Amino acid sequence: LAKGLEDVYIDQTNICYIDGKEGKLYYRGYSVEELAELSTFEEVVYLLWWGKLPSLSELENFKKELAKSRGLPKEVIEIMEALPKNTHPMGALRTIISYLGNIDDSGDIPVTPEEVYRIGISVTAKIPTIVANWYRIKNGLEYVPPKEKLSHAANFLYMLHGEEPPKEWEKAMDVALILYAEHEINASTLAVMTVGSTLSDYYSAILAGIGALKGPIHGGAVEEAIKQFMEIGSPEKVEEWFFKALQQKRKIMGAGHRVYKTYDPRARIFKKYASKLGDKKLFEIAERLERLVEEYLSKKGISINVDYWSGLVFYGMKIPIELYTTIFAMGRIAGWTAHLAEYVSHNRIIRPRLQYVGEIGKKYLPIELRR
Amino acid sequence: LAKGLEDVYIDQTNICYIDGKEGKLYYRGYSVEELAELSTFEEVVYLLWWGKLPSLSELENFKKELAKSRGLPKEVIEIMEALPKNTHPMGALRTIISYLGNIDDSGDIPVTPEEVYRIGISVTAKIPTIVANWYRIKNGLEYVPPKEKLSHAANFLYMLHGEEPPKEWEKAMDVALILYAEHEINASTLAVMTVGSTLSDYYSAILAGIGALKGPIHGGAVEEAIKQFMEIGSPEKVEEWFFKALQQKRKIMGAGHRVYKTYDPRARIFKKYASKLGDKKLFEIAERLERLVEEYLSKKGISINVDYWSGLVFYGMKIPIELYTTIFAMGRIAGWTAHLAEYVSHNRIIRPRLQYVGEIGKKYLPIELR
């Protein structure tokens, strides 16, 4: 019985490698550290989909395809304006992406590698526009069209705030997208691949990813983690909160990982940005709790994961907490697209089994003879 | 390393048992044959969710809860009227279910066994209303609200046709839903459980199921199968077509199964109804092709599956082919809901691995140096 499908390898891959015991991560052979420091989201997406770093012209041309794909048709904006104003961002994105599929000429076409990347360019480019403007529309703010000249990351901050961001913000945001871009076969990527394995359409597949990423013990933890520090209140109450949580068997959000049994390499980088951009008190609370996790839960293999420090970074960039998981989606769409294309290149329906326990051969008894 | 996860047993279950070698199927211990013969969709759903056949009182109350949840809010119908008329039913259903989730006060709540059944009653009851009326709306017909006194199966036909169906149709439709209700951990159910395993909401999980079921080699084959019979054209062209297909490495729709290595027990039952309600010629064509498969592919473990004959049955009840996969969804929502509730009762995130075959440690080269 492979519960949680733990350590079950479902296919070969050339996209990303994770070293859980050592806490190392590579995107097509390049460490996440190197990319976070020297690359950009656009270049990383290019690398993830085509397997190598782009040339000067390859990157400029790809950046151009994306830029001209950020806009949303008027009917899409109309549907956004029709959503219940209280709809949470991930759920709103889910519906909007589904509607985008309905209006796309290729919305029902069975996935193939080439077509997946084509649609991927459009959806990847569009998510930030949907997320930022959903926040605006749900709050009675004016819709802000994308700015072709800004980077993917800068343009998101631009549409959301209605003003171009400072260099340090474009950098933190871009790095955040790179760090969230890809992570092998996590739950959301598995869901995307499972839908793709039936040769369904691109949108149906990405929607499964969105649904899975939304979960509080998956991508949703980015929001639960920061709310958790806020719940603790002050650095002085951390310890008492920690032992109560352990006693209660409560999950410490932002901690633990199916693969990493040591500090998440992405968490190291996020902590660095949270240190320089995050709220001093919250960072203090987070660091205090972090030490307790390392002290008592490390032998168990529970360390800090990617969703622990990222919220503080986004919060420091004046981004509402309700949009953090959608930002994870803004980045992960790259990895989802890469995996969907890779899996269906040599497709095989994903269909496992369950071990039935119970009686078989029970005889039907008319309802009137039942007690 | 298991490409396809063939024979990988992820967890234990008490919902459904499949005997792939013997071609047997049980829902909570009861053969699908018996349930298709003596039960009803509503009763089968109750069995699937709560694990036992209901009492007179239990069934009546359940049927009451379902019937009272069939209607759609004005805002939902409005969204339906806003979708492109050329949207395929499964794609339309997907967007509508997502929206229903948006307007639901529990649309973001982490799944729990009790909550899953609660929401399950609502979505299960609304699918036929959405499906039938999507067809009507997209074609200029008036919206037809659900009729409480009708059974789930009869009500679907009533809304779609604007006319209550004859007893024989209600029966065939009811049986179809029962046969599609549950099937262990198939691709769509795995997708549903995977989303559920992150403790996401009910709607997000079901939508993953809808997206997967949609695939042409999964639930979508029910539409592909009937179109394939019509494509062949006549019992005389079958053999010809059959071999051109085998040589072209084209898959025969309605045939093959990851588990069943023999005739699908559900396909047996569907054939019977297809024989009684299906188009003569189409049936003849399907029959000749069925023989060629049992002849040439039989040895390879490739037999007839549940999606081979159902189309003909739906076609005989004047149901547009474009709605067949959504009908599969209408029934399978029961199994999706059952597994969602059962799995999260002892949750563990579903997260496997991939065998990386590339190199690591590559050094980043400045773009100008490329």
From Swiss-Prot, chain A:
Q: What class of enzyme is it?
A: transferase
Record's superkingdom? Answer: Archaea
> EC annotation?
2.3.3.16
The pathway to which it is assigned is: Carbohydrate metabolism; tricarboxylic acid cycle; isocitrate from oxaloacetate: step 1/2
Intrachain S-S bonds: none
Entry's Gene Ontology molecular function annotations: citrate (Si)-synthase activity
Catalysed reaction(s)? oxaloacetate + acetyl-CoA + H2O = citrate + CoA + H(+)
* Pfam families given in the database record: Citrate_synt
Q: Which GO terms describe its cellular component?
A: cytoplasm
Which of UniProt's keywords are assigned here?
A: Allosteric enzyme, Transferase, Tricarboxylic acid cycle
Spell out the catalytic residues. 257, 307
GO BP: carbohydrate metabolic process; tricarboxylic acid cycle
User: What protein family is recorded?
Assistant: Belongs to the citrate synthase family.
Self-association and partners:
Homodimer.
Under which name does UniProt file this protein? Citrate synthase
**The species this protein was found in:** Pyrococcus furiosus (strain ATCC 43587 / DSM 3638 / JCM 8422 / Vc1)
